[PDB]
Design a binder for this molecule. Structure first.
Ligand SMILES: Nc1nc2c(ncn2[C@@H]2O[C@H](COP(=O)(O)OP(=O)(O)OP(O)(O)=S)[C@@H](O)[C@H]2O)c(=O)[nH]1
Ligand SMILES: [Cl-]
Ligand SMILES: [Mg+2]
Length: 342
């Protein structure tokens, strides 16, 4: 359990259309992905890597005394489409994650794809918190940019505080009807068993510090302890696409283990196993999206979890969703081809 064998866990963001999943991530990243999107909607799985240094800075306003202990090296956050036509991608993102944020519009409560998401979460026993987003839409909300929720909530007028309590109670009742007990996050005395509700605004940043602290807490206090450390390689192909200068590449979620430039890799292809070597192992800059076209950073080595793009010859027939394996010293290359096909 050395700190040079720590693993960055995977957090999926799930929720109904237009609840603010991408906008929340844009506020954390300081990006404008949502503005860029056709229709303002997400149509693919996105991956952004957050080094723990950034998480520490973005939670300082709810950790002023420094007493919160950070143990993760970072977190890979997966953005997903809420639109009904992409249930396959919510399913894939859910299958990949270790923990999750379920985004609910506080003004609307639970909606059809919230219910779909809750089924995914319950089935896989995924620890999650709920972001009750768009609190700035409470009428008369007075913002302090990027504040902790409690601090800001204390400064609101009586009308706003009453409206919040009323909507919060309604949402709690909705979750209870779906079989989930939930509590406002600082009122939750059973983090292991009850869902924490953290009110947020993607527009003002309020509550995001609380939300980030909570997902680190999910990693450190709910996720299986073994997942804090790197073990055997696990990787999944997300997409296959030709990129200028690199030929047909694959975007991969590295879920566990370590990938290296030059690795002999095996994966499923249309006509049978593909066996090739990694020519370039690419990532976005930290806190930038895998689903966004850009210049890429080349790495000799990438430790899990991360979203990577791999350049290699012979990827033309790669199958999205395929597992990916690396040929190790004690492996037989053909035997490994047979194992990936399984
Ligand atoms: N006022 C306010 N508006 C918000 C907030 N969060 C998101 N929005 C707005 O809601 C709209 C939808 O946000 P978006 O980030 O696209 O949702 P999404 O959950 O990613 O939606 P999808 O990709 O599943 S279709 C956008 O216009 C965005 O500006 C918020 O906290 N306050
Ligand atoms: Cl949970
Ligand atoms: Mg989106």
């Amino acid at each position: 359990m050395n700190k040079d064998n720590l693993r960055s866990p995977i957090c999926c963001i799930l929720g109904h259309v237009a609840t603010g999943k991408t906008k929340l991530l844009d506020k954390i990243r300081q990006t404008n992905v949502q503005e860029g999107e056709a229709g303002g909607i997400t149509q693919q799985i996105g991956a952004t890597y957050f080094p723990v240094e950034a998480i520490k800075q973005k939670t300082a306003v709810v950790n002023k005394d420094g007493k919160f202990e950070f143990k993760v090296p970072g977190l890979l956050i997966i953005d997903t489409p809420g639109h009904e036509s992409f249930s396959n991608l919510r399913s894939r993102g859910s299958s990949l994650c270790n923990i999750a944020i379920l985004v609910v519009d506080i003004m609307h409560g639970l909606e059809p794809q919230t219910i779909e998401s809750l089924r995914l979460l319950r089935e896989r026993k995924t620890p999650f918190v709920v972001a009750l987003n768009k609190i700035d839409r409470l009428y008369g909300w007075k913002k302090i940019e990027n504040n902790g929720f409690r601090e800001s909530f204390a400064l609101q007028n009586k009308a706003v505080q009453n409206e919040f309590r009323n909507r919060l109670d309604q949402v709690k009742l909705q979750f209870a009807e779906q079989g989930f007990n939930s509590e406002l996050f600082y009122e939750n005395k059973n983090f292991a068993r009850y869902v924490s509700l953290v009110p947020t605004s993607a527009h003002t940043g309020e509550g995001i510090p609380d939300m980030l602290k909570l997902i680190v807490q999910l990693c450190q206090e709910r996720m299986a302890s073994s997942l804090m450390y790197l073990s055997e390689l696990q990787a999944t192909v997300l997409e296959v696409k030709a990129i200028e200068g690199f030929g047909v590449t694959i975007d991969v979620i590295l879920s566990n283990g370590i990938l290296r430039e030059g690795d002999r890799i095996v994966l499923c292809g249309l006509e049978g196993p593909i066996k090739t070597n990694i020519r370039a192992l690419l990532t976005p800059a930290p806190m930038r999206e895998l689903r966004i076209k850009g210049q890429y950073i080349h790495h000799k080595e990438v430790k899990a979890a991360q979203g990577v793009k791999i350049s290699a010859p012979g990827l033309e027939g790669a199958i999205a969703g395929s597992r990916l394996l690396v040929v190790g010293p004690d492996d037989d290359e053909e035997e490994l081809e047979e194992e990936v096909e399984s």
